[PDB]
Write a protein that binds this ligand. Structure first.
Ligand code: PMP
Ligand code: PMP
Lengths: 384, 384
């Protein structure tokens, strides 16, 4: 044989203990770790289907919707976003994009690649979107879909949602909202706020492992997707196939792909946990924790990047990089000396911020103390 | 709130004990179950990268290649196939497809959706491809890529590979081979047999959980992908991004998507296991087990669908449905009475066969006895 057994693979796997307090992913509670260690069942068994049904009721609970076209995407954040755009937007269609952070910029890049006409409302890191600025774009471009980042995890901004669905619907437009970094950590009502496509990721405030995502489509969305001239560029993400398998339509579930069974075990449990807590409890926890953290960081003499407290994402706090420090020094000092993961910026916010993450079980005063103690020592030990 | 906590989510998760002896997925050994229950690390940490490096050496070992453009796809089988086709085939390009089973038919459907000219060499269930039939197509259509199903898990056929790479290369063509149902269970040498794109799935003979896949690209493939006029229709599967992150190129690893960390733990271990066994041992085990099973099924008076024993896939055995039975009766009887999953057909083979799966740790005489005992009782108890 050409290749011989890799010598590094012949030692036993060993992973460190890290406290993950960056934008994502998050640490796992015991129940979700327990689910990840279970044995396999038939990917198309009665028992697997029952689990998928329970997961759907769960996504309906956290999204606050009754859309029967609700299901899990076998992929990360990007994969739910991509599934949204490749099933909704045909080549030529007009797409209006709130590019307030990396997430809008990505939604742009996808849009361009599948041949949409892409209308970028660039706002500098920290900025948000006013209903009028939306209708001024809506008037200028007459799009079929508006993408809005709810929890902008690259800028620590909480986008206001109220009204925008009723605005978009007047102009015949569809509302797509990125709630990957917001779901479970701030108020969100899909049906009530008139959202057409809502997606979220497992690895954020739900505390499940990365590589699944949540998506729900309103009836209006469903129509646009179920009366395309062409087929979507993706077969893996084709909604008509996915919808069928997950049991959304009238036809019996036909084999599309193989779903990530053990991940669905974990995701199920993550949804059972926030079910047991209750949504408004979870929003309380994250709102208070966030409040505490900004207090402590303010004491250290650090500055919160988002100045208006009504626009600060509870789940991901941006902190202006203190003048005269190498951000990478701080970030490295923290993990090295305290085994805590924090991040720098991302996209427009690259170099400008530090990012701190409070997500689900991880959103405790304990962890805020820890990250504040760690940032203390770093600030007085990193060169100036 | 609109929706209240689902009452089914408020009971504790419980899953049955099934022996999975269908085409896929397979049961997990203890080490892979142990890995799935571990705690999370930073998705972009030094430690996560070291694991990804070890997984790459592993895919190089089982694929038998030194292609430095080798990596995991964050998706199932279809996702590796789709990633192959959307990065290699530009709209208009000529694509020659060995449609001997469902897998070719799917490769067709993808091909059509991304705007390739799709040349379907339909052969009836059980058939394979002769080097001449390939060069007669190669002469007729002058394709940029030929897709060949190695282990045709819908028909139980083992496609001969030897020569075809040297054939395709003469015509400037690229060879793409679907080794999802063959890797680890029959001889396969990527470099030596001159394969340009080879992919496989985790949930088959490697005994890892579904939702990752393995892919490797030769230099020739790399060139075609790294000199496209257009961008691929997919951002999630864009090879230039994936290659970078996984550490294949010269640039430092930039954030694309979040990789399924806990799955990569499991996949790593699945590769460490077949590393410890050794490839030719694993091929021995599956060849013998397969041999035993055909003996036992022959005794029950059942007929093997693939008549030439040199063309029978060791990992997935097709069995002609016995005259005068409802296949679904047998399949249902087996799971109900013996807790064993077997399958019927799929695509062209739908209704025509029963499928039995011997994959990795599951490919033992014990399990062949069990499935043979179970099929015994079914045959004498199902109506005629
Ligand atoms: C707001 C937001 N948008 C998009 C993503 C992308 O998720 P993934 O990298 O898992 O695809 C994330 C996850 N960090 C996110 O928080
Ligand atoms: C030969 C073959 N091709 C394709 C696939 C598709 O794999 P998945 O459903 O995990 O995408 C499989 C898995 N059963 C396979 O065995």
């Amino acid at each position: 044989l050409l290749v011989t057994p890799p010598k590094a693979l012949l030692k036993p796997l060993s992973i460190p203990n890290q406290l993950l307090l960056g934008p994502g992913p998050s640490n796992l509670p015991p129940r979700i770790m327990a689910a990840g260690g279970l044995q396999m069942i038939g990917s198309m068994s009665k028992d697997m289907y029952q689990i998928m049904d329970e997961i759907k009721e769960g996504i309906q609970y956290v999204f606050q919707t009754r859309n029967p076209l609700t299901l899990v995407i076998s992929g990360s954040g990007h994969c739910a976003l991509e599934a949204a755009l490749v099933n909704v937007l045909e080549p030529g269609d007009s797409f209006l994009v709130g590019a307030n952070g990396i997430w809008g910029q990505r939604a742009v890049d996808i849009g361009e690649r599948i041949g949409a006409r892409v209308h970028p409302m660039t706002k500098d890191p920290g900025g948000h979107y006013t209903l009028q600025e939306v209708e001024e774009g809506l008037a200028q471009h007459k799009p079929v879909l508006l993408f809005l980042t709810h929890g902008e995890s690259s800028t620590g901004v909480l986008q206001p949602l109220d009204g925008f669905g009723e605005l978009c619907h007047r102009y015949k437009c569809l509302l797509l909202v990125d709630s990957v970094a917001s779901l479970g950590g701030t108020p969100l009502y899909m049906d009530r706020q008139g959202i057409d496509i809502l997606y979220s990721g497992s690895q954020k405030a739900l505390n499940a492992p990365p590589g699944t995502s949540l998506i729900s489509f309103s009836d209006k969305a469903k129509k646009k997707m179920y009366s395309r001239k062409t087929k979507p560029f993706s077969f893996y993400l084709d909604i008509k196939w996915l919808a069928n398998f997950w049991g959304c339509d009238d036809q019996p579930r036909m084999y599309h792909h193989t779903i990530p069974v053990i991940s669905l075990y974990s995701l199920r449990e993550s949804l059972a946990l926030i079910a047991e807590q209750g949504l408004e409890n979870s929003w309380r926890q994250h709102r208070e924790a966030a409040a505490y953290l900004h207090g402590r960081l303010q004491a250290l003499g650090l500055q919160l990047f988002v100045k208006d407290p009504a626009l600060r994402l509870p789940t991901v706090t941006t902190v202006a990089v203190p003048a005269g420090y190498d951000w990478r020094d701080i970030v490295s000092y923290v993990i090295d000396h305290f085994d805590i993961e924090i991040m720098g910026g991302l996209g427009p916010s690259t170099g400008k911020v530090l990012r701190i993450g409070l997500l689900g079980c991880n959103a405790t005063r304990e962890n805020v103390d820890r990250v504040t103690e760690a940032l203390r020592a770093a600030l007085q030990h990193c060169p100036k």
